[PDB]
Write a protein that binds this ligand. Structure first.
Ligand SMILES: [Zn+2]
Length: 50
């Protein structure tokens, strides 16, 4: 994260789009993802025991 953080830093295409299946947000132009891990709590997904 650096500066505003939005749009496409790649192609200059401000149209992005969301991806609820992965938790992603991609470009609507070049195809480029932005982030794809929109979470940080970790209920029951990492580490296992008992
Ligand atoms: Zn783009």
């Amino acid at each position: 994260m650096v500066n505003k953080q939005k749009v496409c830093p790649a192609c200059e295409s401000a149209e992005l789009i969301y991806d609820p299946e992965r938790g992603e947000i991609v470009c609507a132009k070049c195809g480029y993802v932005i982030e794809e891990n929109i979470i940080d709590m970790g209920p029951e997904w990492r580490a296992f025991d008992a």
